[PDB]
Amino acid sequence: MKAPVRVAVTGAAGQIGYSLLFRIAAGEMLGKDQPVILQLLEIPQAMKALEGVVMELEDCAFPLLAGLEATDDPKVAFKDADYALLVGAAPRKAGMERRDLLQVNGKIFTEQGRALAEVAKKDVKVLVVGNPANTNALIAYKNAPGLNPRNFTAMTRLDHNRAKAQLAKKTGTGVDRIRRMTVWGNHSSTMFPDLFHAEVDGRPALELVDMEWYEKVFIPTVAQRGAAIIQARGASSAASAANAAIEHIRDWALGTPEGDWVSMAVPSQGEYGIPEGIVYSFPVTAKDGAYRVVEGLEINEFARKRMEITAQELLDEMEQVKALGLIRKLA
Amino acid sequence: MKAPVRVAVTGAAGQIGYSLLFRIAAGEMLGKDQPVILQLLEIPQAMKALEGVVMELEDCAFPLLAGLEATDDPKVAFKDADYALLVGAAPRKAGMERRDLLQVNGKIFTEQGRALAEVAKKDVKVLVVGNPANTNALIAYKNAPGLNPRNFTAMTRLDHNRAKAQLAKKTGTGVDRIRRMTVWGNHSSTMFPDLFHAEVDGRPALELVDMEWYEKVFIPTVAQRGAAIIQARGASSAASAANAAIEHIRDWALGTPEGDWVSMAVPSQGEYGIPEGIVYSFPVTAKDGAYRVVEGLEINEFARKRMEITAQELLDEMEQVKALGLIRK
Secondary structure, eight states, X not given: XXXXXXXXXXXXXXHHHHHHHHHHHTTTTTOTTOOEEXXXXXXXXXXXXXXXXHHHHHTTTXXXXXEEEEESXXXXXTTXXXXXXXXXXXXXXXXXXXXXXXXXXXXXXXXXXXXHHHHSOXXXXXXXXXXXXXXXXXXXXXXXXXXXXXXXXXXXXXXXXXXXXXXXXXXXOOGGGEEOOEEEBOSSTTOEEEOSSOEXXXXXXXXXXXXXXXXXXXXXXXXXXXXXXXXXXXXXXXXXXXXXXXXXXXXXXXXXXXXXXXXXXEEOSSGGGOOTTSXXXXXXXXXXXXXXXXXXXXXXXXXXXXXXXXXXXXXXXXXXXXXXXXXXXXX | OOOOEEXXXXXXXXXXXXXXXXXXXXXXXXXXXXXXXXXXXXXXXXXXXXXXXXXXXXXXXXXXXXXXXXXXXXXXXXXXXXXXXXXXXXXXXXXXXXXXXXXXXXXXXXXXXXHHHHHSOTTOEEXXXXXXXXXXXXXXXXXXXXXXGGGEEEOOHHHHHHHHHHHHHHHTOOGGGEEOOEEEBOSSTTOEEEOSSOEETTEEGXXXXXXXXXXXXXXXXXXXXXHHHHHHHSSOOXXXXXHHHHHHHHHHHTBOOTTOOEEEEEEOOSGGGOOSSSEEEEEEEEEXXXXXXXXXXXXXXXXXXXXXXXXXXXXXXXXXXXXXXXXXX
């Protein structure tokens, strides 16, 4: 009964894409009743590989895959898009330093932001996965005049899920009984996983674990988890990143469970005193493609200090992209 | 909710495994009401990577993942297993001839068949994915005394799906309207994709495409599709292979759609005159862990010829393993 929606995915031949696209086409992101048209973008040098990924998608005989098109043109990939998952960012290349990376990312997200504003649905839901996600999302929305800034988000859901997994393991409880986890701030080493409002089968997390464990073990382990995957596998955490992306879009589009919330990095409107405009991870609830920051939560000194550190890092990143003229102003 | 089932997967840190485990844990193989305990096997040198895969699975916070354990011991991985997906086979190392590969696979699938027979559930459902799948399944079940040979299968579902995809493309129809595709025989270059019974939106396939296209374009293209993916991506078709494994198990454990059938390589009981014992792909319907070959189908000359060629290849393969004393002569 449902008309197809168009889902654009960039970096489509890369490792995250390879773990992402099949689950999307299977109906895992937007529902088993929702046909999808996949509009896939790569850089020119990866188009040959992308055509291979297209063949594999065909070879799954997915009943919900109502359309499938690969392109190297963002204005084609984003045409009439209902969702856009911006996975492809500047590749790490030998010789490239931070400022070089910033400029390449600046070009990518300026171009993609502009393309989205020109050709996508006005209510396109955008998720930036490619690193540095929060600041790339800022560049994208600032260069998408005519689109609601709050339709641009960045992914902290992988950190959020990692935090839930660590808490479940420590408390010996099923991860499905962990609620109200929050990761605040930047998708970076300064992220703040918040246990002060989290619940384990209805019980406050900090009645089951102590502050020493929280500070000395939990926080660093969540921060280092991406590195841990690389050390073990010799490859980055593509499958769990793809899972997190699916969950981020799914919970935004289909809604968060009653009594629970999720983490999403979204343009700040001053909630919790976070500077307006920076893309900052907040606890949020969602219903029908719209989300709201969960306000009213008590913030103690431990939390405030960490929320402020990560806010400042985001402000520093913003100043650097402002200095490169990638955005005019934060406000 | 259903009581949890134990799903064993070998080669669990490899490419097919990486595309397979997350969708199993998400409930895509056995249903959204079916919790799964994943019991993962790797060779010792891959255990470090497998622990990394374990961490990634944890980091997905899957509500249905009721247990998760990694091991290098088949008797641990297969313990109380309800399903066993045998993905890891002999790796292609420089300097190894076919005979060397056969010896290594013989060891692997003898050991795993014996382990399954010793420690898995008596009704464990087994799917061999690792190449050469049909013959590896033969070695496995022949060395699995006390287990129903009919519970040992090999995967031709990827060829099946590729065939449906090609027919949908050619006819300009949705792949969801392709029914009754069959791939017969070996998962090899001699496999036979059968359009004589296939239907496109209820219409016989061969009323929409002609025999010239079938023989000259369709068959070679399905046969070469794995090579096509490698040439394009620089890597094998891991994600679509994983998808095919999931569907093979899903349609077997749950059931095939009314009026439709799927392809599964199963130990032959002489259906269609196919020699007995060899693991051969047939059209089958299934439900609740049991399949039945669709019998009574009209087999014309074009089909018969190709069905016999691939049967003979499997017989030759069987004679190879018997001569190495891998199964009883």
